[PDB]
Design a protein around this ligand. Structure first.
Ligand code: RAP
Lengths: 121, 96
């Protein structure tokens, strides 16, 4: 494992690495609409998804549980333009149920996330 | 009059719920029970200005999503259902 623990419990559940420094002072706030590109990989490096296959940035509302916990925690720490890598333990991802067929039970996930933009609503 | 729901609201609420059933509760059956009446209502066609705009903007995408779901029924390949949800998401993010 490599990365800085960004969990509030400091349980090493979500470890972050900055791949490209962004441009804010500002990080997105609860409820903001956030626009990202991303890639997701299993712990063996196998890709399970890339945002680019949908031909536009992925959008979700931050801090509402629309996405797995690791993303709500990780994206809240990012600045506009940043790229980071998140290592996500199963307790902060899909847990024992997984996200079949691609994601098994008890899977640690890797995401690369580029924060493109965020707005208040 | 005012209480009669129209295309945009029915799809917004329905996609939300179908997605909770599928991604949240792993309930493909329930997901289909929500989506099928929504596609079936599109067949009656737009009955208002708002519905005609909605149908012009989103009708083709929803009909494609139904095609991917019908394929899933035969293939069982979850990638087919994923294609459908990319289209439902594409519609949902624009109406919401
Ligand atoms: C086709 O591709 C899928 C995404 C795929 C599914 C399979 C996974 C491997 C994956 O490949 O994404 C993936 O890479 C992944 O793990 N993702 C996607 C990127 C964000 C992080 C993670 C995730 O949390 O996905 C999410 C994960 C799979 C499920 C959620 C995890 C958190 C939990 O609290 C939620 O309970 C409900 C369920 C999926 C999403 O990010 C989408 C956007 C969100 C939802 C479905 C729910 O939040 C839903 O709740 C009602 C909503 O409020 C939405 C906005 C309502 C509208 C109509 C539905 C849109 C559906 C879009 C679906 C999309 C583009």
């Amino acid at each position: 494992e490599q990365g800085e623990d960004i969990t509030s419990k400091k349980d090493r559940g979500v470890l972050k690495i900055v791949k490209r420094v962004g441009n804010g002072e500002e990080t997105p706030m609860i409820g903001d609409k956030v626009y990202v590109h991303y890639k997701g990989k299993l712990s063996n490096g196998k890709k399970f998804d890339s945002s680019h296959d949908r031909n536009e940035p992925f959008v979700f509302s931050l801090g509402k549980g629309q996405v797995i916990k690791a993303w709500d925690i990780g994206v809240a720490t990012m600045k506009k333009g940043e790229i980071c890598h998140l290592l996500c333990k199963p307790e902060y991802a899909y847990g024992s149920a997984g996200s079949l067929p691609k994601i098994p039970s008890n899977a640690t996930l890797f995401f690369e996330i580029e924060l493109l933009d965020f707005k208040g609503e | 009059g005012a209480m009669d729901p129209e295309f945009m609201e029915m799809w917004h609420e329905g996609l939300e719920e179908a997605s909770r059933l599928y991604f949240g509760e792993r309930n493909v059956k329930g997901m289909f029970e929500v989506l099928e009446p929504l596609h079936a209502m599109m067949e009656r066609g737009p009955q208002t200005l708002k519905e005609t705009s909605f149908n012009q903007a989103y009708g083709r995408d929803l009909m494609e999503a139904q095609e991917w779901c019908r394929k899933y029924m035969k293939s069982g390949n979850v990638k087919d259902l994923t294609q459908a949800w990319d289209l439902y998401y594409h519609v949902f993010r624009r109406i919401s």
